[PDB]
Design a binder for this molecule. Structure first.
Ligand SMILES: *Cc1[nH]c(Cc2[nH]cc(CCC(=O)O)c2CC(=O)O)c(CCC(=O)O)c1CC(=O)O
Length: 294
């Protein structure tokens, strides 16, 4: 077949990523007919059902939303070129985090962003914030939050880069696994589709996210977990940093690992176990409601 059906969420951002993949596909294969099959973790389960019942051929996600476990037959096969993986500080009245006076309300529902925020500034009020980027920016403007933390990649792709007051360095707010990268899921036995996707995969980014995901997989993580996992390719080696923290910032467990690109997965697993054997297991047990990594 020459038709390629892309399943995707229906938010402005999700549709941006869908177009991104489509464009890349069209450029590598001028004869391919790409159809979008948008549809309303729960933010991935419906797309996976579409894949299993042949209503779509591939599903485009933001890497950090991709779960660590896949139903048999499905899997991640392509990881596209990574964008700015950093968190961004967005605010209208203030220019930085240090500038926020005591009692300021920062919005984010990410435990990863919160635990790190609270570790440095116990005086701030971290308040939950949910919805598409557009609604989040709306609530900020309505005055419900003094500031909010969002990813740099999302704002840039939406052309809302001017919203970024300051990009928070990884040392301050360690990025979520795969933040800034787009990943494509599809049926493992679908050779044709996989062959078409080969041109979109970005080796270096795949190296980094693999180390990040291996770490997360061992910890049995996801979005609702206070886990940071970020890798860089430094002078031919992968530098992996990871953290697990208590949502109140009182206890944050940190570790790092460095090694050859081909050991990306084992480095991830090793670092994860190191965190686990150092208390991460007790913290994660809270967040998981009894459940804790093996
Ligand atoms: C795992 C997780 N997902 C989200 C929501 C989300 N998913 C993708 C993006 C855009 C950035 C990207 O594609 O890399 C976003 C929104 C964003 O981060 O700007 C979150 C955010 C929850 C929140 O802040 O309320 C998370 C949790 C996490 O990042 O740790």
């Amino acid at each position: 077949d020459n038709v390629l059906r892309i399943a995707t969420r229906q938010s402005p951002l999700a549709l941006w990523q869908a177009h991104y993949v489509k464009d890349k596909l069209m450029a590598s294969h001028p004869g391919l007919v790409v159809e979008l099959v948008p549809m309303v973790g729960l933010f991935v389960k419906e797309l996976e059902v579409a894949l299993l019942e042949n209503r779509a051929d591939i599903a485009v996600h933001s890497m950090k939303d991709v779960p660590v476990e896949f139903p048999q037959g499905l899997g991640l096969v392509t990881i596209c070129e990574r964008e700015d993986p950093r968190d961004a500080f967005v605010s209208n009245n203030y220019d930085s985090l240090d500038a926020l006076p005591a009692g300021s309300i920062v919005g984010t529902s990410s435990l990863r962003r919160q635990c790190q925020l609270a570790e440095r500034r116990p005086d701030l009020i971290i308040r939950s914030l949910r919805g598409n980027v557009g609604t989040r920016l709306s609530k900020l403007d309505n005055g419900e939050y003094d500031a909010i933390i969002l990813a740099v990649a999302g704002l840039k792709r939406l052309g809302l880069e001017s919203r970024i007051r300051a990009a928070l360095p990884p040392e301050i707010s360690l990025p979520a696994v795969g933040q800034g990268a787009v990943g494509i899921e599809c049926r493992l036995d679908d050779s044709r589709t996989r062959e078409l996707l080969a041109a979109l995969n970005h080796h270096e980014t795949a190296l980094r996210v693999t180390a990040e995901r291996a770490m997360n997989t061992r910890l049995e993580g996801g979005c609702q977990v206070p886990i940071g996992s970020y890798a860089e390719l430094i002078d031919g080696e992968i530098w992996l940093r990871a953290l697990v923290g208590a949502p109140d910032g009182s206890q944050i467990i940190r570790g790092e690992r460095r090694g050859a690109p081909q050991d990306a997965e084992q480095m991830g697993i090793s670092l994860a176990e190191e965190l686990l054997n150092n208390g991460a297991r007790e913290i994660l047990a809270e967040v998981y409601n009894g459940d804790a990594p093996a």
